[PDB]
Design a protein around this nucleic acid. Structure first.
Length: 84
DNA sequence: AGCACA
């Protein structure tokens, strides 16, 4: 089953391709969605299974495309990315 | 801390 990650601390100017380049570098990358609301943006990144998602989350934690200090803040998403 | 798409 595909496991989705939640990514915070993103600048509003970051590209979808740019962000893809960050996460596609890790094994099991399936798809990414970049969402914006009022200010800064967040992202949902899907991997082929949990182990690859965990592996990527640990590795990219605090990755320096950000607003605040600390770099990227990544969590497990509360829900899986919808099918299709 | 802040979690959408269908």
């Amino acid at each position: 089953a595909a496991s989705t990650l939640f990514v915070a601390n993103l600048s509003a100017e970051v590209n979808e391709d740019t962000l893809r380049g960050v996460f596609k570098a890790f094994s099991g990358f399936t798809r990414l969605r970049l969402h914006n609301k009022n200010g800064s943006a967040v992202a949902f990144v899907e991997y082929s299974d949990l182990q690859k998602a965990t592996q990527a989350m640990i590795s990219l934690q605090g990755f320096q495309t950000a607003n605040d200090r600390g770099g990227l803040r990544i969590e497990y998403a509360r829900n899986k990315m919808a099918d299709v």
